[PDB]
C-alpha cells in the first residue's frame, strides 16, 4: 500500500488517524485512514481485498511523501 495522489497537485500528506486495526479484514472500500494533505483532510479507503498485517507510518506522522509504504496487506489471514 503506497501513499497515492489523493488530489491532482498533491505531493505529500499526513497520517492523521488510522481507522483500521492491524489484524482486521479489509473489504474494497472500508475507510482505511485519515490523511491530511494541505488541500483537505481526506478519508483514505481500502483498494484491494485483505487483512492488516502491520503499519509502517505511526498515527500522527507528518509530511509523508508520495509512494511511501503505508502498511502491508496479506491475502489469507494466517500471516
Amino acid at each position: 500500500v503506497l501513499l497515492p495522489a489523493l488530489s491532482p497537485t498533491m505531493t505529500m500528506g499526513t497520517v492523521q488517524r488510522w481507522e483500521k486495526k492491524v489484524g482486521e479484514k479489509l473489504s474494497e472500500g472500508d475507510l482505511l485512514a485519515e490523511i491530511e494533505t494541505d488541500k483537505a483532510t481526506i478519508g483514505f479507503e481500502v483498494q484491494e481485498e485483505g487483512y492488516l498485517a502491520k503499519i509502517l507510518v505511526p498515527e500522527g506522522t507528518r509530511d509523508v511523501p508520495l509512494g511511501t509504504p503505508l502498511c502491508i496487506i496479506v491475502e489469507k489471514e494466517a500471516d
Binding site: D38, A40, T41, G43
Partner: protein
Amino acid sequence: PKQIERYSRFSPSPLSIKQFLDFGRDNACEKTSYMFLRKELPVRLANTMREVNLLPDNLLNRPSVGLVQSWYMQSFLELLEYENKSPEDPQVLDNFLQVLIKVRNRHNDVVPTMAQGVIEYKEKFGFDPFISTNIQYFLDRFYTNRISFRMLINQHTLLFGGDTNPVHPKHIGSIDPTCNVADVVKDAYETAKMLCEQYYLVAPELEVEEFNAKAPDKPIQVVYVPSHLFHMLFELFKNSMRATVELYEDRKEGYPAVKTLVTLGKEDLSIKISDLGGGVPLRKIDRLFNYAAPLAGFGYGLPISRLYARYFQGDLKLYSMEGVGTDAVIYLKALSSESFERLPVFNKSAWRHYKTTPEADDWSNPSSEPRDAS
C-alpha cells in the same frame, strides 16, 4: 433471552392522547387495560433491554449497566408471569395492579444509575466520534421508552388503584382534558423566578401574549399531561432567566423581561420563550441537546425536556442570534387525535446503528493547516 428474544420481536403499540382520554373516560374498563398491558409493558421492556445489550463492551461492563439490565429483566419476568392469567377474577387484576406498583418503584432509580454508568465510561474510556454519536442514539430511545413506560403505568394505577382522595379531581389519569397553556406557563415561570430570586436576589419580569387563530378570543387550551409541559417550560425559563441576569448584571438598566408567546393554529400549538441573554453561536446550539460562572442544575436538562416534547409528536427547538438573544420554542400538536406516542422499536433498522464501523465523511473537510494562497 429466549422470551426476551420473542417479545422484543414484537412492536410497541403507540396510543394517541385522544386514546388515553377516551379510554379512561368512555370505557374505564380494567379488563381491557390489563389485557393490553400484560403484553404491551413486557414488549416495550424487551425492545429496550435488547438495545442496551448492543452497547460497546466497555460500557456494557460498567456495574451500573448490568445493574440496570437486571432490574429490567426481573420486572420483565414478574410481568411475563401473566401471559395466561385471566382478567376474570378480581384477584388477578388486583394483583397485577400491585406488580405495576412494584416495578414502578424498582425502576424509579434507573435514570440515576444509567447516567452514572455512562459518565463512569466517558472518563474511563474514550472521547471518539462514532462511539459517542452512538450513545446519544441509545439514550434518546432509552429515556423516551422510560418516559412512555411510566405514562402507561400512571394511567392504569390512577385509573384503577382507586385511591379514595384523588390529588387532581378533574383530570383523567395524568391528562388534563381542558389544559390552560397560559396557566402552565405562569407557574413554570413563577417557580423559576423564586429560584432566581433566592440565588440572584433579582429576576426578569414575565410577559405573555396569546394568539388563538382557531377562535381569536377563547383562551388557548389543550389536551395534554400538564406536568410534562410544566417541565419543558421551567427548563427554558430557567435558562433565559440565567442568561439575562448574567448579562445585565454589570450594566445599569434593570432586567429585560422574558417574553412568551402562545399561539394556537389549525394543527400546531406553539409556545415561544424569548430572552436577550446575548445569544449563542450556532455552533454550540446543536451541542446543547447532547449528553467561569455556575448556579442551578435543577430541572430536567434540555435533552430530556425535548424528549418529552417529541414524545407526543411535538418538538423543542432553539434559535439564537449570537450577540443579542434567543428564541426557544415548544411545538405541540393542536389535536390530541394526532398526538401519538413516539416510541423506539427494536428491529434490524435499530440494529444497524449499534453495528456500524467508522466511515469516511460524506462531505469535504479542510486541512488544519491549509496551503497559503501565494
